[PDB]
């Protein structure tokens, strides 16, 4: 159907069609609020594959996030420590800008659950994302076995605990030798806990 | 137990055995084994020669299972077999010769130390030394290689 065509065309971000549409939409986005409601997904095919459905209780929000690194917020570049910690400028936040987009939209919609998010645009100053949210109080959500899980209280603010797709990526959650540091603190605890058995 | 400890004997002896001149201060030559090249050199060079420096190649991601190969000598080969098998073949004349599968006894290579009795035996092993194979063949036995 149309979804395959939208998926393939979305891969062509340098084509004349997508370059033009990106320019006009980025201009339009910069004219409205940093966080604003989207009436519909700008990328319906991308939204579906990330869990979105066109039913009551699913909500799309758009947000722009400042690009670039994290300047150390210390008074006059003064760090009061050893030279290894004197850096102020070329530093980087450990969470993705997409994660920040989810965090801020989740605070903005504190009655909703953040499901997922996707990139839509960027200029030199901002990256634009659309965040998919679900109303756990809506009956259409609570009676739906495919999205029911998110009502349970263990899924409260899953974006704040790195439990969305981008949150687990930023946490380095993965299988095998490349992710041995694993959940870091839990792995660290296992290796730094002295185990003293009853030798009898 | 504390009752038999030297601490109990030093009650009333002011310096607790650590001297009046030199005392029992906090770390007076540094912590741990720091200083092996400078003020501890006369100890390191006398009791731990070879400590400082690098020797040989690195090997990234060593996995020891493909290297597994415990060894058994010829003088232990007949001890790997049950007592009933020894009595049946060892020293007798039989049409069949016993099979000693060294791998199921936990060995990957048969080495040549010691001697064998003069009875035929079939030694099943992944590896065998040259001298071990010669002595097995002199006893009338054979080596058959396995995986």
């Amino acid at each position: 159907g149309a979804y395959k065509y939208l998926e393939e065309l979305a891969k062509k971000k340098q084509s004349d069609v997508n370059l033009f549409l990106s320019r006009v939409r980025a201009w339009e986005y910069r004219q409205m609020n940093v966080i604003h409601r989207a009436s519909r997904p700008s990328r319906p095919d991308k939204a579906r594959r990330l869990g979105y459905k066109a039913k009551q209780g699913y909500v799309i929000y758009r947000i722009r996030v400042r690009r670039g690194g994290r300047k150390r917020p210390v008074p006059k570049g003064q760090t009061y420590g050893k030279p290894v910690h004197q850096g102020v400028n070329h530093l980087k936040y450990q969470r993705s800008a997409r994660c920040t987009a989810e965090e801020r939209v989740g605070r903005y919609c504190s009655n909703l659950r953040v499901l997922n998010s996707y990139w839509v645009n960027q200029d030199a100053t901002y990256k634009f994302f659309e965040v998919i949210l679900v109303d756990p109080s809506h009956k259409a959500i609570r009676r739906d076995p495919r999205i029911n899980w998110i009502v349970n209280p263990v899924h409260k603010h899953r974006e704040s605990r790195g439990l969305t797709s981008i949150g687990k990526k930023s946490r380095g959650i993965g299988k095998g030798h490349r992710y041995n540091n694993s959940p870091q603190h839990a792995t660290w605890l296992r290796h730094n806990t002295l185990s003293l058995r009853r030798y009898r | 137990p504390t009752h038999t400890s030297k601490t109990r004997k030093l009650r009333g002896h002011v310096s607790a055995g650590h001297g009046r001149i030199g005392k029992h201060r906090k770390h007076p030559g540094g912590r741990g084994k720091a200083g092996g090249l400078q003020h501890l050199r006369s100890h390191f060079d006398k009791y731990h020669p070879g400590y400082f420096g690098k020797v040989g190649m690195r090997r990234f991601h060593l996995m020891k299972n493909p290297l597994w190969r415990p060894t058994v000598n010829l003088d232990r080969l007949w001890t790997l077999v049950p007592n009933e098998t020894r009595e049946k073949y060892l020293g007798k004349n039989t049409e069949v010769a016993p099979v000693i599968n060294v791998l199921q006894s936990g060995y990957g290579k048969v080495l040549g130390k010691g001697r064998l009795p003069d009875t035929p035996v079939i030694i099943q092993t992944r590896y065998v030394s040259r001298r071990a194979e010669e002595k097995i063949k002199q006893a009338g036995g054979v080596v058959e290689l396995i995986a």
Partner: protein
């Protein structure tokens, strides 16, 4: 000092294990590859904040280096190295 550009010496090379004529030259250090593991390690260590991470020699003296003679067997292409005492002046032939 004055050292002849040619000398007849024992050749340790496997094909000429005898006295042969050699061409004499002074040894000079090679030009410091960027791919050597120690340089790769040092460069990785020096990146980021923390400043200078390893000692650096700020002085220099004892400019009398031991003279190292490179002896090339004329025909065999075999090269040998010979060490002499320190000196301020060197001249081949």
């Amino acid at each position: 000092v004055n050292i002849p550009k040619t000398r007849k010496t024992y050749c340790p090379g496997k094909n000429c294990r005898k006295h042969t004529v050699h061409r004499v030259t002074q040894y000079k250090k090679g030009p410091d590859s960027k791919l050597a593991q120690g340089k790769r390690r040092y460069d990785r260590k020096q990146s980021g904040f923390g400043g200078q991470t390893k000692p650096v020699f700020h002085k220099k003296a004892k400019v009398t280096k031991k003279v190292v003679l490179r002896l090339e067997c004329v025909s065999c292409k075999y090269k040998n190295q010979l060490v002499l005492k320190r000196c301020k002046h060197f001249e081949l032939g």
